[PDB]
Design a protein around this ligand. Structure first.
Ligand code: WM5
Length: 133
């Protein structure tokens, strides 16, 4: 009953500061413009100890499956090849991505009826709000 309140299908409803986050990450102009337009659906499921997060949009369809605390390799939607580790910290899913000596953290939290996603790169934070589909 690990992660029960995250499971389901979620749709992006608002975003703030995501272009600046993507700049901080090193995403180029054209990818930023197309990615910034996307309205993804985030589909979260659990089977035993394995969590799957799918992100589907007109920009890209991605899928990750993982066990909490167990590193995995991920190709991100913007084509970074990263080493990722996802843990649960006080009810928040914390996703750390490492590549080229850099690091970014993506937090997913349940707040009221929303799933709030915070993406942080250095001093730049972006908040993306998802609602149930
Ligand atoms: C952590 O995600 C990113 C970081 C940098 C650049 C892009 C992304 N990924 C996205 C951006 C917009 C819409 C959907 C996604 C997705 O992942 O499906």
């Amino acid at each position: 009953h690990m992660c029960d309140a995250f499971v389901g299908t979620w749709k992006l409803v608002s975003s703030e500061n995501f272009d600046d986050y993507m700049k901080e990450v090193g995403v180029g102009f054209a990818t930023r413009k197309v990615a910034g337009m996307a309205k993804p659906n985030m589909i979260i499921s659990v089977n035993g100890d394995v969590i799957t997060i799918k992100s589907e949009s007109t920009f890209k369809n991605t899928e990750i499956s993982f066990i909490l605390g167990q590193e995995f390799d991920e190709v991100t939607a913007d084509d970074r090849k990263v080493k990722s580790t996802i843990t649960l910290d006080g009810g928040v899913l914390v996703h750390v991505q490492k590549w080229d000596g850099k690091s970014t953290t993506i937090k997913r939290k349940r707040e009221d009826d929303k799933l709030v996603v915070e993406c942080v790169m250095k001093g730049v934070t972006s908040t993306r709000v998802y609602e149930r589909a």
